């Protein structure tokens, strides 16, 4: 007895020609990485990046004639499997995936909340960490937060890891774009490494898998074809483990 989303994913495969042998070339995007992680908190930080990558891809094709129904069906099955049909959880996740790391007000708010964010990640920051963060608050210079209110909404650890994955990847991107900026270049480097230490729990393997996931462009046609080829197997492992 087959899950209804399967036939729709096979329809997308035909549309993208992702059943052609050329799609095999050059390893895997998602499957191997997911193989590496078995504890549920580690799976949720990786799955969180995989799900936002599929959501950005589907937004580029939601209306394409013969696949509008298929895309709708698959997004709704991801909702059931990954968000447990929780509309507020899905909405907080979309908000976080859509923040622009180049909007100066967004970057200010993000640098403002940084210390509190590490707290929320379970980190006990050093005196050093605190000073480097005030450098950045100076450089960059509302009754609404970027990240703190969303983090206050979720208490179960798997829900927290889903959101924390999107906050850590936003910061890592903000840091990349300022990595070699004269004034604040040593601040950026200092924070950047204690965030890595804590989130990845001193596991270089986990850290590397995460940067791989974070640096694929959903724009290249070949990446997009591989993503569509791997969809059915990715969906089969999206539900909570046992």
């Amino acid at each position: 007895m087959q899950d209804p989303y399967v036939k729709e994913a096979e329809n997308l495969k035909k549309y993208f020609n992702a059943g052609h042998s050329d799609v095999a070339d050059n390893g895997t995007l998602f499957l191997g990485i997911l193989k590496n992680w078995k504890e549920e908190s580690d799976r949720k930080i990786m799955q969180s990046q995989i799900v936002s990558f599929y959501f950005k891809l589907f937004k580029n094709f939601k209306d394409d004639q013969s696949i509008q129904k298929s895309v709708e069906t698959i997004k709704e099955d991801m909702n059931v499997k990954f968000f447990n049909s929780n509309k507020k959880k899905r909405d907080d996740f979309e908000k976080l995936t859509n923040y622009s790391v180049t909007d100066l007000n967004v970057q200010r708010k993000a640098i403002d909340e940084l210390i509190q964010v590490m707290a929320e990640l379970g980190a006990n920051v050093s005196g050093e960490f605190v000073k480097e963060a005030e450098n950045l608050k100076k450089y960059f210079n509302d009754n609404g937060t970027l990240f703190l209110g969303i983090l206050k909404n979720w208490k179960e650890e798997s829900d927290r890891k889903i959101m924390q994955s999107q906050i850590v990847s936003f910061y890592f991107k903000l840091f990349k774009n300022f990595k070699d900026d004269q004034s604040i270049q040593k601040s950026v480097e200092t924070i950047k490494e204690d965030m890595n230490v804590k989130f990845f729990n001193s596991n270089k393997k986990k850290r590397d898998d995460f940067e791989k996931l974070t640096n694929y462009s959903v724009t290249d046609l070949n990446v997009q074809r591989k993503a569509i080829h791997e969809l059915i197997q990715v969906m089969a492992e999206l539900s909570p483990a046992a």
Partner: protein, 201 residues
């Protein structure tokens, strides 16, 4: 040379074999078969069989994970002249092959019958495993179907699943058969021949 035709892949109990057909020629043709697995390092096809004159090739040694896709291609040769490659459609053992039946044992207790369902021999860390067993029971002239979820249940392990059925209504003969349902594509294994037990009233 002309091109091989009707390239097909068949698998029973995870033993994939490639087949093709070829027309009559004035000389004896030889063939080469190549396999490409999803997740390959670069863009290379691997030789399965080289220069054979018969029309099939067992590729069991080239299957990675049964859930992962693979493609096969075949070309013919005449000394120095090679044909174009004939290509297979995408194939995944778990989705496209067929698995044999589970083996069942029944025994009786006071008010119930205990059924042990041993997983098909091929299964004794891939997503190709049995997710549920559909169990078909006939008792005297009535029939009922039960379902066993292998993951959300203390009932199942790596060797077998167990099920307890209640005895009732003065029925004296209970006959049971089962089929497994694979994870990911929901493909079914073959259904076991029915085994029966007699209850003395």
């Amino acid at each position: 040379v002309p091109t091989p035709t009707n390239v097909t892949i068949e698998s029973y109990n995870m033993n994939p074999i490639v087949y093709w057909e070829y027309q009559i020629m004035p000389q004896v043709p030889v063939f080469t078969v190549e396999v490409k697995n999803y997740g390959v390092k670069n863009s290379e096809w691997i030789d399965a069989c080289i220069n054979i004159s018969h029309h099939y090739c067992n590729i069991s040694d080239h299957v990675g994970d049964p859930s992962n896709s693979l493609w096969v291609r075949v070309k013919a040769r005449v000394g120095q002249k090679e044909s174009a490659y004939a290509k297979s459609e995408e194939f995944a053992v778990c989705r496209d092959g067929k698995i044999g039946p589970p083996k069942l044992d029944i025994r009786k207790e006071e008010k119930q019958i205990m059924i042990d369902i041993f997983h098909p021999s091929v299964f004794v860390e891939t997503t190709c495993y049995i997710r549920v067993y559909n169990v078909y029971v006939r008792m005297n002239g009535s029939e009922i179907q039960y379902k066993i979820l292998t993951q959300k249940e203390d009932d199942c392990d790596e060797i077998q699943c167990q099920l307890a059925i209640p005895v009732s209504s003065l029925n004296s003969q209970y006959c049971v058969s089962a089929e497994g349902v694979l994870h990911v594509w929901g493909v079914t294994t073959e259904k076991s021949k029915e085994v029966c037990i007699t209850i003395f009233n």
